A paper describes a structure:
The LbcA density in the CtpA–LbcA EM map thickens in the middle of the TPR region, suggesting that the TPR domain may fluctuate in multiple conformations. Therefore, we performed a heterogeneous refinement leading to two CtpA–LbcA EM maps. As expected, the two CtpA hexamers in the two 3D maps are superimposable but the two LbcA supercoils are wide apart, with one supercoil in a higher position remote to the front CtpA and the other in a lower position proximal to the front CtpA. We next performed focused refinement in the top one-third region of the two maps and derived two local EM maps at around 4 Å resolution. We found that in these two local structures, the LbcA adaptor domain (H1–H6) binds to CtpA in essentially the same binding mode, and the difference between the two structures is limited to the LbcA TPR domain, which is 44 Å and 18 Å, respectively, above the front CtpA. However, both conformations were in complex with active CtpA, implying that the two positions of the superhelical TPR domain have no effect on the allosteric activation mechanism. To bring the C-termini of these substrates to the CtpA substrate binding tunnel, the TPR domain of LbcA needs to be configured flexibly to accommodate the substrates with different sizes.
During bacterial cell growth, hydrolases cleave peptide cross-links between strands of the peptidoglycan sacculus to allow new strand insertion. The Pseudomonas aeruginosa carboxyl-terminal processing protease (CTP) CtpA regulates some of these hydrolases by degrading them. CtpA assembles as an inactive hexamer composed of a trimer-of-dimers, but its lipoprotein binding partner LbcA activates CtpA by an unknown mechanism. LbcA has an N-terminal adaptor domain that binds to CtpA, and a C-terminal superhelical tetratricopeptide repeat domain.
Numbering used by the authors:
A (entry chain A): 38 to 375, 411 to 436
B (entry chain B): 38 to 371, 410 to 436
C (entry chain E): 193 to 268, 276 to 326, 350 to 436
D (entry chain C): 44 to 575
Write the structure that this text describes.
Amino acid sequence: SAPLPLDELRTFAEVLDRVKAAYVEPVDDKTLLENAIKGMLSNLDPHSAYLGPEDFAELQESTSGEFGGLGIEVGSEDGFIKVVSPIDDTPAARAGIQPGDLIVQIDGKPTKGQSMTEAVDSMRGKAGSPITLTIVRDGGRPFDVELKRAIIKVKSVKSQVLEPGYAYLRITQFQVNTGEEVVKALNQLRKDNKGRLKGLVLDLRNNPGGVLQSAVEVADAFLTKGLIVYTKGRIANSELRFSADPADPSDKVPLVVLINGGSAAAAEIVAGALQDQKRAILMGTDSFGKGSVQTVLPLNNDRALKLTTALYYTPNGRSIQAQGIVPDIEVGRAKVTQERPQDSDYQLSQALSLLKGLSVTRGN
Amino acid sequence: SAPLPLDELRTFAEVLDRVKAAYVEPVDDKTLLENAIKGMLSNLDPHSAYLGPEDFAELQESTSGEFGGLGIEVGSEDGFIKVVSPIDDTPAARAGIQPGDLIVQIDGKPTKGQSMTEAVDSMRGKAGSPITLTIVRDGGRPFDVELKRAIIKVKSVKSQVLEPGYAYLRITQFQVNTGEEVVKALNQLRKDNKGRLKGLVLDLRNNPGGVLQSAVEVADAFLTKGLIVYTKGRIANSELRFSADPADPSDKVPLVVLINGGSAAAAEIVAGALQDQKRAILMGTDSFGKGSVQTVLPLNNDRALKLTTALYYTPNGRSIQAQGIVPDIEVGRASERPQDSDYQLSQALSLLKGLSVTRGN
Amino acid sequence: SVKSQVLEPGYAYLRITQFQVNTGEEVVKALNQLRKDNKGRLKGLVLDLRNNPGGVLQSAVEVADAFLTKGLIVYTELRFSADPADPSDKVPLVVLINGGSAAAAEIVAGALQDQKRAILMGTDSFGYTPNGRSIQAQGIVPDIEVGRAKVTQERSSFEGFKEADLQGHLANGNGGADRPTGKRAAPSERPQDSDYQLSQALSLLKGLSVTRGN
Amino acid sequence: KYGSFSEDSLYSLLVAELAGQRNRFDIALSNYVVQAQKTRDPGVSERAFRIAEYLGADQEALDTSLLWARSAPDNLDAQRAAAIQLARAGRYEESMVYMEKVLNGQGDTHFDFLALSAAETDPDTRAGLLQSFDHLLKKYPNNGQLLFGKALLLQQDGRPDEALTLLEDNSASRHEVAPLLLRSRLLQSMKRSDEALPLLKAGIKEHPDDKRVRLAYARLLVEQNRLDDAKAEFAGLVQQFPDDDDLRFSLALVCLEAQAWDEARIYLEELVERDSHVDAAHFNLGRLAEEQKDTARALDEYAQVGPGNDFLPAQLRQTDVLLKAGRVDEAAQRLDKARSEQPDYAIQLYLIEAEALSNNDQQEKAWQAIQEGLKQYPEDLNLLYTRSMLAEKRNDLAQMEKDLRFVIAREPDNAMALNALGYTLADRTTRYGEARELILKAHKLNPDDPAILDSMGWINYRQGKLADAERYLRQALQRYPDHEVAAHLGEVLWAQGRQGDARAIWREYLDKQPDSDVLRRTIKRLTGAETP
């Protein structure tokens, strides 16, 4: 028989009445109640917030890389569109599109006078909708190319070989398919070196976050045994524990994790799992220090509030919330005065040197 | 009649109870409802806010003034606290800050998702205390700016003389007495000139504005007839208007107003009235556009809320809100005499000289 | 001679300038006072043997034995066994060679390389060791070669805001204090910050101390 | 487009829905009903009506339903819900008006509820609704559900002929479901299956998918006493859909009644495996065991019957079978333990055993059981009757007389005890005044019961008068022809000196049953000769 907030609701009703009466622009009750919901969710805590239909669709497309379009990453500067990269497995490459190509009209809409966000919005469209592009090559007469909009997946993970025996793997962002992406990347890196991998470096610099399951899957892919992360909340359904399976494609190769100031909850989960397990050596600047797991609860009219349900903990037990993880080797951005990424990037060079020294002192 | 929106109320109640159930920490519904009120008052109108009973109590008798400030007027736009104008003669003025700059981060706390009232209150602090805040200027990357805040008093009106028959009357800020001081300065300049001026360039730029009554007073001090400004709003008492008596201390002097990008409501209103009454001409960057009227009204339980009861209108019907003021002629700003230090002042004085010479009066 | 500057809570830097007489007392006292400064625990003792031409052989052998327990340190018809006595306390060791360690420091570095106790990081020495390999003939090839250089940090115009900054954040799980986004000047530019070689040595030592075990 | 909330309206709805989420639905319903009455908007009214229906407050349900219907007359659902609630409230012609509004917007209608509540309705109000439905038919002759309702009204009146003929006239009505089921019910009322079977088969042809028509046909076939057709119909029904459990139970019952023990046993075994309605399943398993003559299965199935209405008859049948098949010790101990399980059932089962032993004509066990029952529960009148019967068997009238006297004193208005005591006393005692006054009191208390007039005729013959005895025996025959009444008639004929009349009177009952026990006993008592 817990009492209800009668006086509080009376104040709320009085506020709504006075707002509808005294506000300048006539406001229908729909907007006011929507604003009240957004207020509850926003003012409860920083990250939690209401989601609109379009924003919910945006989040769903972000978590699941599959998005409607053609699959070309571009940047608009000086009024002309620069083709940064035509992504693989898309008609863009099959359409003869090349870097730096000057797209003049998207579906007949001129590309000049448009902002970057406006250009991206115009380029994007409903999946399966045919798109005609008028392109001017070297300032010549424009030519028309017809393509079909489809689902394009964005490769979250990028892998390469720095020096013979040393491989580099960067995680742009955590996505649903990131686990299989990491597994296959590790497999292909291992087979590339014909079986032996001297040293591995992982990069999580400026990783805003992602779905928790993918982070746990990556941590499992870089751990033979142990518990990855347990989340606690006042609701039983949220109380959970995720632990690593015996399978480990890494095959016990030295690992170095880079955590920058932009690495957030999802990436910090992998960082903590690989650190507290004594499987990898963190290095860089302090992390974003964000501790929370958020659930999106479906609602009518496909606008679903996302709420922070529980706080996760590192396997040891310490909570990184509001304090984060202090890297073991705090090497900051700097310039050293006496196609290889290490030379340009200082932190990557330091990590490569550390791995080289560790492998050499192992003599293997 | 039309049906009630009961579906939405069902949705709101469901969301409230679900949030109570599935949060990280046990949150009593009182806090949830208070947050709902604050959001319903903030999301729609950035300037408006919910002032609790203790907020209203402290607002009835504000602080004694021992805590100074930065002398920066900010207008919350697109979720970013935007500096509508740094008041002249202040560390903000002395330091490099220009109208339109976004103070994204202040004292290390991001301002996005934060209402302007708490931002300005945090900006207020003890006299002569250091403080650092970020700025995103004209799209440039953030750069920390450290400066010392202290109590600032600025003379409302400062007058000067450029060339025979021409004088320049800068209005730092509209104060309660600004009308009397403006009239006194105009009389002083008239007596010094020994005759009717050849044109009194009025420099209302970088002016956060003040009490509307002062703006009406100045407008009338220049204007002999017409209605300076009228406010319209949904509530019946919202309708208001002002008018100018024939008393004309300006002595029918020619006038040319200047409008930079940092002109606020009061300055906006006076400049718009003068232009729309054909009593002057404008030249400078378009005004900011702020024309709302935030008013505090109580509801119950010894508390009150601040909401935009009504918005202004210049006599010719132009909406001073969402459009700013477009000067009939435009110019971009770009010891040294005042007429040469800034390009806009030089252009204004030269154009006024040409007009007066051509007319022959 | 001995100069003992503690870099981090677990890593301490010891430098030998000149091998004067009875430097064993100075070095052992430095080790003891360091242990007390670190409560009796070390993670790794970078012994920077650079710009040190050397000194009496006996003092160098004394230092070696202070750092070693078994094996024959140096033999030219002369040997030098190793008694267990060692204030080293089984600390991971990283000796540095700048190419200016001529005779005695070179002998110490070579002996510690050969007996596997330590690791040689700096450049090859300018200039016998327990193994058949000589010293004055071939110099001393370091295990990991790191060319000397300088490093400078650049100023951060804006500071990434931590969750302590966002108003109304969530307190950490265990109830501990939340680290704010403050700014306090360092006591001074530590050697780790200036010279690339020593920064590399400290980083490698930290990596070993972490990955090696719990 | 959308209306607006007054402050108090918003407050009320918000608090109501919060309370509803906290399950304090009383506040929710009160606030919602008040706001629905005030605003009268369709949304609030409909939500309030749904809450009331979920809770089930008839007054609030009806108020909200009618308010919703008024708020949005266009909506069909509101009109039908208001009509149903109003019918639930006893006001029926208004519900018929609302149903007319429903029919204006073509859609589903529920007139069977109207007809059933009219059956519940009082005869005067029933006639009012009858005239209202006649007016509707004049307005709406097309509809068939109003025809069903008027036919049900007539059936409640007792003359379904008119409505049945009117329904049969319309081919569409003959083609529907509810009219056909009602026609079957009416035919059963008039008891002419010769027309129910053909029309029911025609309906089965019209839409065999439905189950009600086929079930009605099966019931009519069961009435017809035909078994092959009923079994074929039941098998076809099961094959079409074995899901229904009631269909399976009816199938098993018909199978048992059709002398099909194997398939009935299969159905009972699968029902027991499902363990639904298991008591009757085991009862029928024991029945088919009896039909198979196997005593072990017959007794064990009835022992396995769980407590219930069918258990006690099953227990009595098990006792009878056990006594027939010997094994007195095991049957007695099983019954004794089952009785000690529950005293209330214990008394009934002890009485059953004592009566069975008395019928079987044994003395020691019957007396043991009856005396045990009397000692444990001496106050029960059934035990007193059993002791009186045992005394009559023992040839002593004292115990029976005292027990029946105490029973008569216990119930001043009873008549069965008085008639039994009078008949037994006149059978044994030489004096007839006591039995005469006992039977006179029995007749005054209850003269309709046939045993009362039977004993009256017996005592009147004992007195020696002919007219009164003969008239009372005639009255007993009128109530029910009983062999004891004819026995007293033959006794009167004997006492009047004519032996041929009584000879023929008992010859008729000998023809009724060649080896009747009571007839032989009375013959040896009266005639006194082996050859009557």
